mmCIF file of C-alpha atoms in Angstrom:
data_model
loop_
_atom_site.group_PDB
_atom_site.id
_atom_site.type_symbol
_atom_site.label_atom_id
_atom_site.label_comp_id
_atom_site.label_asym_id
_atom_site.label_seq_id
_atom_site.Cartn_x
_atom_site.Cartn_y
_atom_site.Cartn_z
ATOM 1 C CA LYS W 1 -44.509 185.825 79.815
ATOM 2 C CA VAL W 2 -42.390 187.204 82.375
ATOM 3 C CA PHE W 3 -41.842 184.877 85.363
ATOM 4 C CA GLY W 4 -39.589 185.405 88.035
ATOM 5 C CA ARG W 5 -37.718 182.752 90.586
ATOM 6 C CA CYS W 6 -39.920 180.785 92.590
ATOM 7 C CA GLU W 7 -43.456 181.276 90.532
ATOM 8 C CA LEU W 8 -42.229 178.936 87.874
ATOM 9 C CA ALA W 9 -40.454 175.607 90.569
ATOM 10 C CA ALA W 10 -43.464 174.128 91.805
ATOM 11 C CA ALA W 11 -44.184 173.345 87.879
ATOM 12 C CA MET W 12 -41.212 170.910 86.995
ATOM 13 C CA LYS W 13 -41.903 169.347 89.212
ATOM 14 C CA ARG W 14 -46.030 167.758 88.109
ATOM 15 C CA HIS W 15 -43.737 167.426 84.632
ATOM 16 C CA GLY W 16 -41.920 164.453 86.795
ATOM 17 C CA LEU W 17 -38.198 165.764 86.710
ATOM 18 C CA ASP W 18 -37.002 166.121 90.571
ATOM 19 C CA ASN W 19 -33.762 163.381 90.211
ATOM 20 C CA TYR W 20 -34.878 162.550 86.718
ATOM 21 C CA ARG W 21 -32.159 159.535 85.439
ATOM 22 C CA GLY W 22 -30.621 161.203 88.608
ATOM 23 C CA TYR W 23 -30.910 164.939 88.399
ATOM 24 C CA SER W 24 -31.946 167.231 90.939
ATOM 25 C CA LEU W 25 -34.267 169.679 91.169
ATOM 26 C CA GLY W 26 -31.443 172.365 92.112
ATOM 27 C CA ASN W 27 -29.809 171.364 88.667
ATOM 28 C CA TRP W 28 -32.124 173.038 86.939
ATOM 29 C CA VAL W 29 -33.406 176.428 88.624
ATOM 30 C CA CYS W 30 -29.959 177.688 86.852
ATOM 31 C CA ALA W 31 -30.297 176.997 83.187
ATOM 32 C CA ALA W 32 -33.542 178.800 81.691
ATOM 33 C CA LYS W 33 -32.006 182.389 83.509
ATOM 34 C CA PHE W 34 -29.280 181.878 81.144
ATOM 35 C CA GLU W 35 -31.008 181.086 78.282
ATOM 36 C CA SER W 36 -33.481 183.393 78.682
ATOM 37 C CA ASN W 37 -33.706 185.015 81.527
ATOM 38 C CA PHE W 38 -37.180 183.583 83.249
ATOM 39 C CA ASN W 39 -38.878 183.922 79.908
ATOM 40 C CA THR W 40 -40.671 182.516 77.886
ATOM 41 C CA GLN W 41 -40.277 183.885 74.906
ATOM 42 C CA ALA W 42 -36.834 185.027 74.198
ATOM 43 C CA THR W 43 -34.979 183.152 71.409
ATOM 44 C CA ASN W 44 -30.921 183.026 70.036
ATOM 45 C CA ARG W 45 -29.682 183.125 66.377
ATOM 46 C CA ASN W 46 -27.276 180.775 66.488
ATOM 47 C CA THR W 47 -24.793 180.661 63.966
ATOM 48 C CA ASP W 48 -25.084 177.578 62.478
ATOM 49 C CA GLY W 49 -27.885 179.300 60.667
ATOM 50 C CA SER W 50 -30.653 177.238 63.593
ATOM 51 C CA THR W 51 -32.203 179.708 65.643
ATOM 52 C CA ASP W 52 -33.212 178.819 69.518
ATOM 53 C CA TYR W 53 -36.256 178.511 71.048
ATOM 54 C CA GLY W 54 -38.484 178.941 74.447
ATOM 55 C CA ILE W 55 -37.184 179.501 77.748
ATOM 56 C CA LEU W 56 -34.625 176.431 77.008
ATOM 57 C CA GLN W 57 -33.444 177.941 73.632
ATOM 58 C CA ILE W 58 -33.796 174.672 72.268
ATOM 59 C CA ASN W 59 -32.224 174.398 68.834
ATOM 60 C CA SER W 60 -34.105 173.769 65.313
ATOM 61 C CA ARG W 61 -31.248 171.352 64.085
ATOM 62 C CA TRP W 62 -32.608 167.660 65.169
ATOM 63 C CA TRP W 63 -35.292 167.988 67.548
ATOM 64 C CA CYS W 64 -38.051 171.075 65.876
ATOM 65 C CA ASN W 65 -39.455 172.056 63.133
ATOM 66 C CA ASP W 66 -39.192 175.107 61.853
ATOM 67 C CA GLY W 67 -38.701 174.806 58.391
ATOM 68 C CA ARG W 68 -36.649 176.897 57.580
ATOM 69 C CA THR W 69 -33.611 175.104 59.363
ATOM 70 C CA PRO W 70 -32.884 172.627 56.095
ATOM 71 C CA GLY W 71 -31.873 169.117 56.540
ATOM 72 C CA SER W 72 -32.552 168.827 59.974
ATOM 73 C CA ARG W 73 -33.548 166.003 62.069
ATOM 74 C CA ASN W 74 -36.786 166.260 62.919
ATOM 75 C CA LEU W 75 -36.980 164.348 65.750
ATOM 76 C CA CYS W 76 -39.682 165.932 68.103
ATOM 77 C CA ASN W 77 -42.343 166.763 65.252
ATOM 78 C CA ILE W 78 -43.636 169.760 67.178
ATOM 79 C CA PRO W 79 -43.390 173.474 65.805
ATOM 80 C CA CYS W 80 -40.692 174.643 67.418
ATOM 81 C CA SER W 81 -43.281 177.812 67.875
ATOM 82 C CA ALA W 82 -45.264 175.605 70.549
ATOM 83 C CA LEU W 83 -41.621 175.867 72.433
ATOM 84 C CA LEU W 84 -42.485 179.117 72.941
ATOM 85 C CA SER W 85 -46.098 178.702 73.758
ATOM 86 C CA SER W 86 -47.302 179.868 77.515
ATOM 87 C CA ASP W 87 -48.285 177.051 78.730
ATOM 88 C CA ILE W 88 -45.327 175.167 79.421
ATOM 89 C CA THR W 89 -46.447 171.610 78.859
ATOM 90 C CA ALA W 90 -44.621 171.293 75.330
ATOM 91 C CA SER W 91 -41.490 172.045 75.763
ATOM 92 C CA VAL W 92 -40.255 169.526 79.107
ATOM 93 C CA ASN W 93 -41.904 166.448 76.870
ATOM 94 C CA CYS W 94 -39.437 166.475 74.059
ATOM 95 C CA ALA W 95 -36.573 168.000 76.766
ATOM 96 C CA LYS W 96 -36.507 164.631 78.844
ATOM 97 C CA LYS W 97 -35.134 162.606 75.676
ATOM 98 C CA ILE W 98 -32.509 164.776 75.330
ATOM 99 C CA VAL W 99 -30.465 164.300 78.474
ATOM 100 C CA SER W 100 -31.308 160.361 77.191
ATOM 101 C CA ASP W 101 -29.345 161.835 74.296
ATOM 102 C CA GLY W 102 -26.501 160.328 76.179
ATOM 103 C CA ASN W 103 -24.853 163.810 77.360
ATOM 104 C CA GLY W 104 -27.028 164.770 79.258
ATOM 105 C CA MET W 105 -27.169 168.421 80.379
ATOM 106 C CA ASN W 106 -24.305 168.416 78.501
ATOM 107 C CA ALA W 107 -25.823 169.189 75.745
ATOM 108 C CA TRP W 108 -26.313 172.903 76.851
ATOM 109 C CA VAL W 109 -23.471 175.498 77.179
ATOM 110 C CA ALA W 110 -24.548 178.146 79.975
ATOM 111 C CA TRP W 111 -25.313 175.073 82.730
ATOM 112 C CA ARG W 112 -21.865 173.593 82.056
ATOM 113 C CA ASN W 113 -19.246 176.571 81.797
ATOM 114 C CA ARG W 114 -22.701 178.158 83.787
ATOM 115 C CA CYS W 115 -24.453 175.956 86.099
ATOM 116 C CA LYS W 116 -21.788 172.468 87.430
ATOM 117 C CA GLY W 117 -20.066 172.691 90.766
ATOM 118 C CA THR W 118 -21.902 175.419 92.276
ATOM 119 C CA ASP W 119 -24.426 174.888 95.488
ATOM 120 C CA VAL W 120 -27.067 173.840 93.167
ATOM 121 C CA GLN W 121 -29.082 173.520 96.162
ATOM 122 C CA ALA W 122 -28.946 176.944 96.696
ATOM 123 C CA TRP W 123 -31.019 178.300 93.878
ATOM 124 C CA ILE W 124 -34.249 176.075 95.523
ATOM 125 C CA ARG W 125 -34.039 177.268 99.097
ATOM 126 C CA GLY W 126 -36.512 179.568 101.165
ATOM 127 C CA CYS W 127 -39.319 178.554 99.189
ATOM 128 C CA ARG W 128 -41.673 175.572 99.870
ATOM 129 C CA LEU W 129 -41.625 172.382 97.793
#
């Protein structure tokens, strides 16, 4: 599905992520534009042979099941296709854990070299939360 800016914003609090282990509401919005440009269906090809799925571009290597990526850890044990689903519900559930992985948001390339140190709470302004 093709999204736009505020159209998605509340659907994330619903899953329990505002200030989750301290990462506030402003810091997430930034990232999904950068890994998919508000669209659930985009996927990236990584030089490591793994692919990236969902708006978040989750990598087949440690978490999900695609099967084309051999020897990967299947920690999630979900279809990577689940990641692509029109219903957002799936992805989130295995995303929370990944921050628990200890690098936090430092697992994502964009947010790091593209989202830190900005007015993170600017992305959420004008809207009704």
